[model samples]
Target chain A: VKLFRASEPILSVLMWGVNHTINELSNVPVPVMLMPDDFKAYSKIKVDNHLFNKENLPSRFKFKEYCPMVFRNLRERFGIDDQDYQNSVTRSAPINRFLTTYDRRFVIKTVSSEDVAEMHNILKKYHQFIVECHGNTLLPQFLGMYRLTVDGVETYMVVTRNVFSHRLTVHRKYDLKGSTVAREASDKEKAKDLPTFKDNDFLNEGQKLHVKKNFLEKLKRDVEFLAQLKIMDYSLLVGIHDVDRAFFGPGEFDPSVDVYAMKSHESSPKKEVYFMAIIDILTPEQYSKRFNEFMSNILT
Target chain B: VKLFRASEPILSVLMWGVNHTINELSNVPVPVMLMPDDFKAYSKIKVDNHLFNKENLPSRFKFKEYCPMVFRNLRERFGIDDQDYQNSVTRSAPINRFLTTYDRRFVIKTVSSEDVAEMHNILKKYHQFIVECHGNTLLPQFLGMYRLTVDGVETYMVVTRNVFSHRLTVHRKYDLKGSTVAREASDKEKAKDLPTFKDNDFLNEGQKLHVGEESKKNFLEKLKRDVEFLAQLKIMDYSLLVGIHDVDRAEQEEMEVEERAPGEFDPSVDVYAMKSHESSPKKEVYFMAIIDILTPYVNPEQYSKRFNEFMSNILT
Candidate 1:
């Protein structure tokens, strides 16, 4: 039934894995509260369909979901349905690691084995914080993580709900960290359709992000939590959508779906919608103080 | 973690087959109407998990779902959710061919390869009839059919909504067809707690099912249409599987009635069960479903008419 159809075998296996893990979780009774051991738990399924369905997938592959219960709970807290998450990945091949699902509702990124270990190390505390905050944070909405083995090559991937709106297009974007030295986008990157500018470039352009007071409050709380976790040098990823230049009913976006987006004030010089979120929060702690100061200065 | 836990490799494969096919179907777009080729189509998946996760399953196995589109359509028409069907099979090993889901909502019965082929032969017309009747039939409500190959041995199985209620306990049962010649239960069968009696045993006991006039008329109408369809396919030798549950006895037997009231069953799950009329000979619940709808060589026309008449007469 679910073809798990994809351009690459890895994508197909990923689709297969998400569908499998979600269905299996449905059978398990949701516990009153997640157990401590849930953070260490994983479910591994090795599938070898000899010669039957090999056109779109490998005849044999292994799919392992890391801390399935924890991720499932996290997904719920993030206001995501397991079936909807499954559908986003499995309904079609993710568009084309740093890959977004076909519908752009999620992003699938390839991470290193060391990063996975770091995730494992931080998972228990991460889950506790997520529960405490009720999943309201500027940090990435970590949804699902997995390790897939095909052709005996093991690849680890982490899935996060996309920070950018699935519908609104970003006319310009920037990855802003506090560091000014060597923070500019490469000329080649600038040549791309949507280049990622840096903090220095953003400051030089005299850009100011207008956000409600509550948005800054949320940002303060989230940044402090990251600082407590000893994470530093995280970038503020900002995507700007200019309504006058494009479409979608003049900057209209669903707040629930576009969780990170905010409309520019009516009195602002230009009509715009801004998507702002913290990214690269896994760095070792050193610059949280400067990072917090830099982000706060950009807001009006 | 599921392992599709089972005693036999065939059972494991069956569990895996239903789970796989159902999940696979979730990705396929439900068509506006089933195409002609859908009847002839099938989905085959062969697994060789090469020495991985083999505690409850073999390292190598194959699963083939017959006419996946047709079966999915039939399941929907029969009011079964694909996910629920998958859960029933993969959530646990079917409790120990006359097998049932752990919850007893579905029956998994082993059938011959020839029967699978016969099913293919009649499936199109069968689906059409089911559609016409709006899935109201005394005939078996076939949900899914599959074939499994494990260790060079091939097994075929058919899944149906269980004829008996998942909660109700059948005190006595019988398999009734028109012919009574040599149709009595053996001494060995009678020794069991709930022996499956035969047509002659039913006759000797003077058993008459009072299903109320409305139910009787509807039951007979369904039987007439179902038998005629079978006759057109030159099939015969099917029987009515009757299971009787004494409501009072079961109530006195156990007071832990958690889900529903006595003699009250969800029509959706217990599709074939009916409560006896208040003035009936016994205060009971009866489950009646047509079984073994594959046969022939004899005059299907005559046997079907006789079968229809015999079943009709049993219901007052």
Candidate 2:
């Protein structure tokens, strides 16, 4: 639980809140249809117990889950078990900032209240889009969203499936939005333990990664989805797992755990696994077409 | 939220779990029949943290719900609403927990993992019987079961519809098994709150809580069907949990008279309470439901029939 030693109350509260809420969901019987209340519904809890885990976690705080019923359904659509996902985080403190949950199976990022307000605005449409795609699109799987109040400071968090794998470590990572703007990585970011690169970095290096035709078809449809949503500035968050460079654990990973993960052919020039997915689709259809247009030149 | 100050962490955990899982069920689509795994299936989580509500709760703990799919079907057969049930608990922690939900609408009882194991042993047939009865039965409704571990001290709990009202007070309560030997409450327990008065008390006191013929017929028919279902399951010792709310005899009756909705006893409230079809000798309310089904029985048919005969005699 101690990479960052768990943030005070906010992070632990996320873990605690998530743990409690998911367990509560285990008892509710399945409904015939989601109600209007579900889309707008949320559960909030406040505790006065200062005697408990008061170390890095706060003794007193508030935790609120946004539209619980809706996210619960979204999780199901993603073929992810609520419990397994719960374990991924609460089992330990999520180590990194904008922290991916402990197991890194999910990401928890801080957002503004209006981001939450905006989420509420787009949630219905986004959820409807998720359903229409049959959980098969590359769009971010927004599993849950929440708000945490610590020491009177209110912070909001959004959770989505990690584009990377729970088990396989990403050797090189890229955050590509297909924009010609200053989308490339800075020298500082490139120096981090796991540096994030970008579009020009990808093209300048003349790196061409390939997956099966079935893969691009999904990617094409996913972009069309973003294009139709008329959203832009979203990135194609990419992570490549270099099989030979890492210790040779001679097997594949949980395909479900790494839905975006793809292994290079045995005879390929480089043995690697590429994880690519569309992220940050908060913009609109105009950018998706340009981004979608740029992608067709590379994958073939 | 202000209405639920009495709610506790465990109840909150429970409500959240059920709320999420049912929504999870909406995804799998219904299957034609139970699979081997469905009976054996479970959902459990463990948490250890600092500054997380480690005061009342273990900084570390686990929560497990057994056989969710079967239970959802049981909920359906029982005519229970998933969302409403979720609200009843999540809306507030149960009151008696330390025993029941804050609403007293659900009884969340501490149980053993062994007890959970026994449930798996009988759930299949019990579910089938409930299906045959079309959800009508005298059995205490099983709403949810869970396991919470705090620092390795495991707490198993089960939720059920309160045999008494979430609002009404049970001035006197009894646990009846119709057994002749050693089935009475001692003088000591009777001195305590809601002492479970027993068969000896009923017979010696000549307690007669009666219903009209039709209501009597409805009650006993369901009782008979439930008893036989028990008999069929090789199960035993189904105690009739009896709670009486004597309206006219009350001093603190103001409690029930507060300004409220036009609706009488909430249907969701008194699951086991029955209004006397006629209140000639002053209207009375009796809350009775069957409970304490002896663990996963496999050889109690004759014994249960005898138990049934004795119970029928007591009713008349």
Model 1 agreement with the true structure over A83-196: per-residue lDDT tens digits? 899989988999765899999989988988988987887788888888888877888889999999999999999998888999988888999888746588888998987788
How far residue A46's Cα lies from its native spot in candidate 1, in Å, is 3.1
User: Backbone clashes per model, in order?
Assistant: 10, 37
Q: Against the hidden true structure, what lDDT does model 2 obtain?
A: 0.70
The candidate that achieves the highest TM-score relative to the unseen native structure: 1
Q: Who wins the DockQ comparison?
A: 1
TM-score of chain A of each: 0.96, 0.90
lDDT (Cα, tens digit) per residue for candidate 2, span B1-316 = 2122333555445554555455444434556877767777765544433332233333344556677777777766666777667776656655643476556766777777776776778777777777777766788677666666544666777777778887777888888876656578889987788787888877788887777687678788888888877777667767888888877655346645653431137644565667765644647778888987646552477667666776786553
Q: Each candidate's DockQ score against the native complex?
A: 0.08, 0.03
